Each structure stands twice: as structure tokens, then as C-alpha cells.
Amino acid sequence: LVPRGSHMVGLIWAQATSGVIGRGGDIPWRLPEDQAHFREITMGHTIVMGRRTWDSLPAKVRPLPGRRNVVLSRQADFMASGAEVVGSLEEALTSPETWVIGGGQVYALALPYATRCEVTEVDIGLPREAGDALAPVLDETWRGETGEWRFSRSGLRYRLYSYHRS
Numbered sequence: 001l002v003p004r005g006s007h008m009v010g011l012i013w014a015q016a017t018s019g020v021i022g023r024g025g026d027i028p029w030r031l032p033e034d035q036a037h038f039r040e041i042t043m044g045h046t047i048v049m050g051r052r053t054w055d056s057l058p059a060k061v062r063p064l065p066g067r068r069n070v071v072l073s074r075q076a077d078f079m080a081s082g083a084e085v086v087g088s089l090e091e092a093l094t095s096p097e098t099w100v101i102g103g104g105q106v107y108a109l110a111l112p113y114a115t116r117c118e119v120t121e122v123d124i125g126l127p128r129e130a131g132d133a134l135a136p137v138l139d140e141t142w143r144g145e146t147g148e149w150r151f152s153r154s155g156l157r158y159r160l161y162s163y164h165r166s
């Protein structure tokens with residue numbers, strides 16, 4: 001339904017209400033429904049991530065299956081078995097559809113080129129702390145849909161946002 005020849009760049013992240021997305025090299029909650037949602041949006045596309053986000057993935061689950069994994073690093077010799085390692089976004093965004101999957105630093109690099117954001121908001125009270133990874137703050141050029149709150153099996157509630165721009 002989209003004519004060929006374009007390069008869609010999307011950002012996808014899950015945040016606490018505060019904007020925190022990462023802490024102690026991990027995501028500070030677990031939400032299997034967000035894992036399923038993440039897999040559904042990114043499946044079959046290129047995924048780009050920072051080196052710390054690659055490191056945050058358990059060895060037994062990376063590279064993420066069904067997707068072209070791209071890792072951004074300033075270390076040319078970085079070992080990312082099953083993934084491409086790139087030194088800038090200049091050649092990371094060549095696929096028809098690329099999803100930037102974190103973390104805090106890489107969202108900021110890629111935001112200027114993005115036309116979709118898929119956000120999971122988790123209703124957990126985590127005030128920002130020194131060294132937290134934080135979500136980008138979208139400006140007024142973004143528009144989109146806010147989903148209904150839903151309870152996960154753990155009792156945490158969450159909701160999905162789908163943002164778009166030209």
C-alpha cells in the first residue's frame with residue numbers, strides 16, 4: 001500500500017510515566033504484553049540499537065530473530081555475533097523500513113529522521129534518577145492516537161501510543 005523506494009524510520013520504546021526507559025543497564029519492569037507488541041511492530045524489518053542496548057539483551061536471545069540487527073558503536077572491533085556494526089546512522093537507515101529500538105542516546109540521534117513513534121506507557125512510579133536513560137520528548141510536529149489503559153497479567157497497567165508525522 002506504500003509505493004516502493006521510500007525509507008521509513010520509526011522509533012519504538014516503552015517508558016514509565018516519568019519518561020524513564022532504562023536503569024542499571026536494564027528495563028526496570030517486565031511486561032510480556034509489551035514484548036509481544038514490540039515483536040509485532042518490528043518483525044521483518046531492520047532494527048537499529050545502541051551498543052549498550054545490544055549488551056542489555058541476554059546472549060541466548062540475540063540477534064533478535066526475523067529482523068536485520070544493526071548495532072551502533074564507536075568501537076570498530078565491537079563483537080556483535082549475528083549483527084552488523086556501524087559507526088554512524090548514515091548507512092544504518094537504508095532499508096525500506098527501519099525501527100530504532102533504543103536506547104536513550106540512539107533515539108536522540110535518529111529522531112530527526114523519524115516519521116513514526118510507537119510508545120508504550122507503563123503506569124509505574126519511577127521518578128527520574130541520576131544516570132537513567134530517558135525517552136525523547138516529542139515536539140508539536142507529531143500527531144497520533146492514544147490507546148486505552150489495559151492491565152497486564154502482573155497487574156501493572158499500560159497503554160499504547162502511535163505517533164506519525166510527514
Ligand SMILES: NC(=O)c1ccc[n+]([C@@H]2O[C@H](COP(=O)([O-])OP(=O)(O)OC[C@H]3O[C@@H](n4cnc5c(N)ncnc54)[C@H](OP(=O)(O)O)[C@@H]3O)[C@@H](O)[C@H]2O)c1
Binds near residue numbers: 027050072102
Ligand atoms: N524501555 C525501552 O524501550 C528501552 C529500549 C532500549 C533500551 N533500553 C534501556 O536503555 C538503556 C541503554 O540506553 P543508553 O542511552 O544508555 O545507550 P544506547 O543508546 O543503547 O547505546 C549507546 C552507545 O551507542 C554508541 N553511540 C552513541 N552515540 C553514538 C554516535 N553518535 N556514533 C557512534 N556510536 C554512538 C555508543 O557505543 P560505544 O560505547 O560502544 O561506542 C554508546 O555507548 C538500558 O538500560 C536499556 O535496557 C530501554
Ligand SMILES: CCc1nc(N)nc(N)c1OCCCOc1ccccc1CC[C@H](O)CO
Binds near residue numbers: 012039100
Ligand atoms: C520489549 C522491550 C521494548 N519494548 C518496546 N516497546 N520498545 C523497545 N524498544 C523495547 O526494547 C527492545 C530492546 C530491549 O529488549 C528487551 C529487554 C527486556 C526484556 C525483553 C526485551 C525484548 C527482547 C526480545 O523480546 C527477546 O529476545
Ligand SMILES: [Cl-]
Binds near residue numbers: 035038039064
Ligand atoms: Cl522480540
Ligand SMILES: [Cl-]
Binds near residue numbers: 132133135
Ligand atoms: Cl537518555
Ligand SMILES: [Cl-]
Binds near residue numbers: 111112113
Ligand atoms: Cl525532530
